[PDB]
Design a protein around this ligand. Sequence first.
Ligand SMILES: Nc1ncnc2c1ncn2[C@@H]1O[C@H](COP(=O)(O)OP(=O)(O)OP(=O)(O)O)[C@@H](O)[C@H]1O
Ligand SMILES: [Mg+2]
Ligand SMILES: [Mg+2]
Length: 145
Amino acid sequence: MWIQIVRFMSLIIDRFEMTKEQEFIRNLPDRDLYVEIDQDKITQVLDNIISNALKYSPEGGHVTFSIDVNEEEELLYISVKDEGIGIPKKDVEKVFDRFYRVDLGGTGLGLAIAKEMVQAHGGDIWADSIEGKGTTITFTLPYKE
Ligand SMILES: Nc1ncnc2c1ncn2[C@@H]1O[C@H](COP(=O)(O)OP(=O)(O)OP(=O)(O)O)[C@@H](O)[C@H]1O
Ligand SMILES: [Mg+2]
Ligand SMILES: [Mg+2]
């Protein structure tokens, strides 16, 4: 089954934008884009990435969501950017590994789950980060329309 990913994400962000206190910025197209992934799996992917962005963010920092369309590859690129503590250069591609944490204390599965779910549905995921400036997590999903 297919879901309209723009609507879907807006509602996810809305439930985060409306609870407690933190800013949320959007680069989301007025386009009818569909992905074939169960609601609950894509929810876990996004919840896990958003949870990290907020957990590791300071001040009234911005979390920015983007969806960009690669028509040639038939892929959407979905990204979550924060202005948080960032990730050490040597660790940036360890962060998706099961139980891996940058520093007894914590689980370290959020991003492993996100990777497994994205990959199972034909996408890929990566982290771009500068220690002390912030992190972008980006994943792809096949789409139609
Ligand atoms: N947005 C981010 N900014 C800075 N560091 C991050 C960010 N996202 C993840 N990390 C680092 O990557 C590690 C792995 O993240 P992941 O979500 O898998 O585990 P966790 O948040 O530590 O635990 P869990 O999500 O299972 O409760 C984190 O422990 C943290 O060091
Ligand atoms: Mg986490
Ligand atoms: Mg693959």
